[PDB]
Amino acid sequence: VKLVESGGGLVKPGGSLKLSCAASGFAFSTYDMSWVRQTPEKRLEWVATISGGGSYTYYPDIVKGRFTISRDNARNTLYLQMSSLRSEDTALYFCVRQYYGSSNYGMDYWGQGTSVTVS
Amino acid sequence: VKLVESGGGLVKPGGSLKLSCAASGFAFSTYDMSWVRQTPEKRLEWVATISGGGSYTYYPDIVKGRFTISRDNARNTLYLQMSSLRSEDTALYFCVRQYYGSSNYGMDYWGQGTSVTVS
Amino acid sequence: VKLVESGGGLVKPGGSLKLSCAASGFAFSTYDMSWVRQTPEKRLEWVATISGGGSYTYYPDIVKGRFTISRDNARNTLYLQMSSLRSEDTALYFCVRQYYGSSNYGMDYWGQGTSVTVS
Amino acid sequence: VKLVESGGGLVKPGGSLKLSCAASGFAFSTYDMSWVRQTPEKRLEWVATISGGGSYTYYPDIVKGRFTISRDNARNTLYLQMSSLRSEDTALYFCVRQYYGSSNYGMDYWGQGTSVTVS
Amino acid sequence: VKLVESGGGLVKPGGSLKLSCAASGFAFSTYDMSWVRQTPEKRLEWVATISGGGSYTYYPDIVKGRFTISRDNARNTLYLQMSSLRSEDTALYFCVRQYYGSSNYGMDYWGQGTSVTVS
Amino acid sequence: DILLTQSPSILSVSPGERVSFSCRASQSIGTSIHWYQQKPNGSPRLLIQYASQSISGIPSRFSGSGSGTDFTLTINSVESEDIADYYCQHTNGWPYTFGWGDHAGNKP
Amino acid sequence: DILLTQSPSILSVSPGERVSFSCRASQSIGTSIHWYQQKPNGSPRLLIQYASQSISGIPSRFSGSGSGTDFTLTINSVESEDIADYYCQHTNGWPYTFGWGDHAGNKP
Amino acid sequence: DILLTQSPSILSVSPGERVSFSCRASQSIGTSIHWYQQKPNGSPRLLIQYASQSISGIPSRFSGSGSGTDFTLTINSVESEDIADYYCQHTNGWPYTFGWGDHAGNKP
Amino acid sequence: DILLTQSPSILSVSPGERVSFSCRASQSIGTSIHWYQQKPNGSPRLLIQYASQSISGIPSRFSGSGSGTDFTLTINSVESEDIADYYCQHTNGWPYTFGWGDHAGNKP
Amino acid sequence: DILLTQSPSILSVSPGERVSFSCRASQSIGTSIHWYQQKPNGSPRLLIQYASQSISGIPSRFSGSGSGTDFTLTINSVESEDIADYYCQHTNGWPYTFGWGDHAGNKP
Amino acid sequence: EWTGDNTNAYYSDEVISELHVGQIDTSPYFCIKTVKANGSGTPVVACAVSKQSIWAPSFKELLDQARYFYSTGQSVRIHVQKNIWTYPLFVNTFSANALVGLSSCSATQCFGPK
Amino acid sequence: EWTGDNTNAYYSDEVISELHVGQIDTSPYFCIKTVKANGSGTPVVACAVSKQSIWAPSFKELLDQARYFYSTGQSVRIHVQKNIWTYPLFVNTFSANALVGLSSCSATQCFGPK
Amino acid sequence: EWTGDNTNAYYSDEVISELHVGQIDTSPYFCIKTVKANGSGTPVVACAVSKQSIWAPSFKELLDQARYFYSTGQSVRIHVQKNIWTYPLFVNTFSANALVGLSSCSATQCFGPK
Amino acid sequence: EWTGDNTNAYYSDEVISELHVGQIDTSPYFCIKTVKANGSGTPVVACAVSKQSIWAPSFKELLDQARYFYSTGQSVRIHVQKNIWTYPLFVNTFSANALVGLSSCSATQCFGPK
Amino acid sequence: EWTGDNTNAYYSDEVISELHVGQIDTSPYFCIKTVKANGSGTPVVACAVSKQSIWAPSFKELLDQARYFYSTGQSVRIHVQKNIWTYPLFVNTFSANALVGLSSCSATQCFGPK
């Protein structure tokens, strides 16, 4: 499967969550991964790109400081820790490794997608 | 045994399977491996072939897009994923070792042979 | 969490304890760690700076000879061993990494802090 | 002990066997092993020398092609697959290292030896 | 604890035992160990020692053939195998490391002390 | 940021005919625009990188093109298995704005 | 050793205004002074290193300064989420004497 | 592709006599043709690679030969244990077309 | 071999006074003699190496000396916690003959 | 191959006297002959390599010799613990033919 | 991914002129800069990070070769894969390329893919 | 397998003339090309991949040696095994051989198997 | 963390003049000392200890480069991070800096961050 | 277990003349051949196979040294342990010895055991 | 422990004159021998074993440096810790010291501890 997304159910408007993307079959030390947000209108949104080791993170203008990302090499996780969620942010939240471990190329393998809901 | 070839006993005409062919006692990172089928008429036919890491893959003319051979190092598996199984393709499905690793030499010791059937 | 400290309850005035501060987030061979105490008047004191491998160790003039600290890089612990506990020394006893592996710099994320008491 | 053997208590005249002969605490990748049999007349015979990696095997004139050894370095095992056992070949079948790991030298130290018998 | 010295009790005058002395927290491949006897009159004596790998071994004058010291790296043991125990040799039998890992320097971090008895 | 206008939003095309989407950018991106394919109730899959470079393991009928502020994916011969959403993406600056996503409708 | 004089001990300031603590040292240190922040019932967090260098992942509101024997932290615009204790450290030499700690009180 | 003709399909030979199969290719292969031996209800095993080079661990009675479009396997002295199927490998290019497979029948 | 004469065998000394043992060896040893300290019902601990070099981690009170065939340990100021056996050791050649062991007695 | 004649087959010798076996070879061996010692109901152990080179760890009384086609083991001083079988080995070529094996008998 | 594919650009007759060694993102790296042999042409900067991308396993086997061509001064062909690194200031200082090959060059023809 | 068997062809009096370093299939490789000392004869290209075949463990012991003989310019004997690599374009560019040894050569005789 | 940040000071046009190798705290280290090319300026000692700081993974990739610039005698730029080592008497002999880069440069601005 | 025992023969005042690198039994090896400095005496061959004998750990520490003395051309002392390798054709081509040390030599005396 | 403590003696203005490589106790080792630059003074021998003492991790970082100063011929300062090796007949041939550093030396002052 190479990508097992676990975590994320229903959360009151202001709670928190902690996702996971346990990977299996590639060099997790390389291949800076990211996160991609769906929408009930079927539109994709970018959130919380990570770098190789983890010393560099990038977030969109909509979500900055509200989310945080990490990497545990030798454990192969991503752990998107979300802070107080507004009425929005109800989506699938895939996590994807980039192409050739770069970030200017694209997205190769998309996970299954959890389901976060705020109500 | 060095080769197990576990998986696949019966599938309706259109399902799918995954044949493991786990290895035990050689350098699995090297030794380009492949799959070879028998027939009910006892005539061997070629099925697929994967290179060292997996970036290079070849198939015959009869099979293109239906079969997809993979390779998962650090676990020594092959995982031939079938799809759109026609009325044919009822065989033994051995896996080989390609003596000296090269694909231009032959087949080292073969497996035991599974038994796929479509009816 | 990357920093969990186990051990330390109530101890008669003269007993002994052994805190743990198991760390599983970063490289433990590097990142010389230390210990920092609280105080019921909300003041902080430094007691137990360690070096990289453990050959070098420093203590303050207030607490020297009583406390001895170790390091097991194969198990990622600190194991501060208290002894001859006076009526003082009732604090939280966090443990920190020096943000570069250099005690001349600040401190990265602190632990949770145990609760030592002498009565 | 460093050398423990296992396998063979009784085999009809024509059966087969498999002796494990697992080593414990030396560089099994080096130290080309061998096999040495006793005889109810207390005479020793040579059987099935092996090399370091395993690509070079040597057998006596009495047993050629009838026996086949296999070294399983990275698992510390010296499998010997007997085949077509005659009325003879009822012996101890010790295991031996080689002094400094060379067949041109003497045998370092022997195991305990199983007991094979042909009814 | 870094030293356990497990094994050793009461033995008739002529039996045999083995004293483990398992090590935990240092480079046991280096740090050639030794054995030290404390007769019940509180006078320490010397027993066998072992070199780095184990190829070199030294014994006192009183002990030559009765005792033999081994070393099993990757498990960090010593395994002093006693034999032909006379009426004497009923002592503590510490196992001790070395300063900087050299027999030419003092002894560092003595064990806990077992109890052998011959009666 | 840079907005990506994927016009139109529907392409009703009979099987066996070339289709062409349009992820018309706002700012001059150059050639850093990619394409995906998300079937209904599924995870998308990269099709063309840099609007010109395809990817192995994919049938070569997907032939992207475009440069500047006008990019287009060109499926030369459609099939009944290409009914999916086709998004576009950015990688030139932050953030990475996706696109609208069109449908390949095949009506018998 | 070196002692810490964190004067004053309380800063009652309305939200949206610059504040300035003062960890006036005893002996001339230079610029080896850090600043922490421990919210009530929590573990502190480093804010500013060497009295001038900030740290990534921290909002740029915290802007330290000072050199010699007069050092200060300058939160340009306070908020209601900055009610915490602000310590200071002396990493010039053994021992590492922490500071007293001040409060950022916001009263409506 | 390249087809391999393994004629005939049966070889009834008394034990203790040299046999010779025949594997005539369609296109010139050169010397990249290998042989196997699959006993009834079993997995095959390599006998001769590149039509000239044998393999270690194999009894030296097997001796392949051939070059161009005519390749043959020459078992010099047959036995009652050589009753098995002998196939042809082909590795000049993709795909790797096997052979038909002949039997070594021994009748007393 | 070499024999160690640790004379005397008991040192009854009031707390707060310098004491001195003696490892009067037989053969000339140079400076290859160490010192230990075994409290009653416990494992000993190295104090001084080569009769001159102390060891980090111990209190600086223990100050050894000696060269040739006369070696001694000089505890400058004794305490009530120094009641233990002070042994002796050789490292010239095998065997490593230890010493007798003296007791530091403190009587009020 | 090479045959090894270990004559005689028994050595009834009183304790405290030198014994001498004889593993007289047929073909010229040079100096590639070893010696073992298998006590009754036990596994043997190497004693002397190349008929001259002893092995560390054994009692130094075992002193081998011999060169050409006449090799012998010389236990200078026997004991009551040397009652065991003494074999000889070859390493010139294949196979490694062992020896017959003699018995050191001590009768009071 | 092969070195001399159709998506990796190459520059011929280059002469390595500089070399910088350091560390970024807890992984060592190195960057070169090659001016053409005949003086013309613009320099071509191309870095290589130890463990960041799919070109990780070819780091050490290349650093020892980039130092060889530096010490001698012979014309070499250099293969690069453009737009790999995404670091904020690292891209603007040296370049955004990625060193993937150091083919030696003869007078007329060069030994390597194209 | 041994280097100088009867199935591995060799070439004597070869002089290493080029050297290419790169990566293919997530594993570094290197290819040489040797023209005869006296100018005659055809070049003999022979590569070596890090982890692809049974000749994997002899990679670093050869790369450091194939690079030594390059710097000096001395005649060497080279052993190769025909038809190992099965890559689509890698075979057509350099060669399909496999470097399995670099025996040094004296004036008359060469030290190595044959 | 990157080498040429705003917190790591650098020194341009420096010639490596000495080199010491040893061990401290069960980890090998090495220290250099560079006097300016034109003789002016003060020396800038800068050590580098393995398995001690975040600059540990860049140890071997730098030690092989500090030897190169030493053997030749060419002017180089050096990047350091001040006040890292906290060893009692080690910072008093060599320095308290930490070597993080070795940029080569002949005449113009040096190839590297600034 | 030591280089200069009484069972390991040595040869003094020898100049390394050849060097062959390869692979046997899935393990890289290397063999040298040294003719005496003054031209007299017979050459002695001594190989060293990795991960085969008890002298495996000293492989890389020797190959880097056996290659140093080759490039310079100075007299060296060589210690060998006769009759180690038991390979069928490998023994007949180079030798059956085993390289266990390369003691440097001087005019009168050589630094090493004897 | 640090190199330049008060318990490790050092020798200044020494020229490395020999170098021996081998194996003892299943671990490679190497021993040097240095005569003073001006010819006076007794030679100093100092070995280093790979897997024996507390100075194990600094083995490879020193062997590459002790071999550098050998090839050039420049004055160096050498730090040793006396009476480390306890091998029976090994301490009688080379020495019983332990190499723990090779500080480079200038004309007047030497860069390193003392």
Side-chain angles (χ1 to χ4, degrees), chain J residues 2 9 15 23 25 27 30 36-37 40 44 47-49 51 58 80 82 87:
Chain J
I2 321 163
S9 171
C23 187
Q27 164 174 0
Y36 300 80
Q37 174 171 46
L47 290 175
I48 292 156
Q49 288 202 321
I58 68 170
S80 291
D82 292 5
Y87 297 104

Side-chain angles (χ1 to χ4, degrees), chain N residues 91-107:
Chain N
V91 166
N92 179 84
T93 312
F94 318 92
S95 199
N97 302 121
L99 193 64
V100 292
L102 281 83
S103 316
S104 165
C105 276
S106 282

Side-chain angles (χ1 to χ4, degrees), chain I residues 55-79:
Chain I
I55 293 174
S56 316
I58 81 181
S60 44
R61 305 184 292 103
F62 311 96
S63 45
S65 88
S67 165
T69 76
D70 174 284
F71 305 81
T72 175
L73 203 156
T74 80
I75 294 185
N76 44 7
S77 285
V78 288
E79 270 176 39

Side-chain angles (χ1 to χ4, degrees), chain G residues 4-16:
Chain G
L4 273 300
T5 66
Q6 196 156 10
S7 45
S9 159
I10 175 66
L11 296 186
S12 87
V13 171
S14 167

Side-chain angles (χ1 to χ4, degrees), chain G residues 3-104:
Chain G
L3 204 74
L4 273 300
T5 66
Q6 196 156 10
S7 45
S9 159
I10 175 66
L11 296 186
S12 87
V13 171
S14 167
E17 173 203 338
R18 196 215 300 105
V19 298
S20 311
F21 315 88
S22 198
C23 275
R24 211 168 300 102
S26 297
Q27 174 203 340
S28 186
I29 313 172
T31 176
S32 88
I33 287 178
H34 315 289
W35 295 85
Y36 301 81
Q37 171 171 48
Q38 176 193 18
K39 297 184 189 302
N41 214 47
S43 87
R45 163 182 66 97
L46 192 48
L47 290 175
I48 294 153
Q49 288 184 6
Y50 272 61
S52 316
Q53 318 177 11
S54 315
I55 295 174
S56 315
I58 286 172
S60 195
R61 308 186 294 103
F62 315 96
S63 45
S65 88
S67 159
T69 61
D70 174 284
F71 301 77
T72 174
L73 202 156
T74 80
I75 294 187
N76 44 22
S77 285
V78 289
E79 261 165 39
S80 285
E81 61 155 0
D82 299 342
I83 314 178
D85 314 328
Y86 291 86
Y87 297 108
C88 57
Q89 195 183 12
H90 284 173
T91 50
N92 66 280
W94 326 101
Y96 294 167
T97 42
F98 276 56
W100 293 4
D102 302 339
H103 288 80

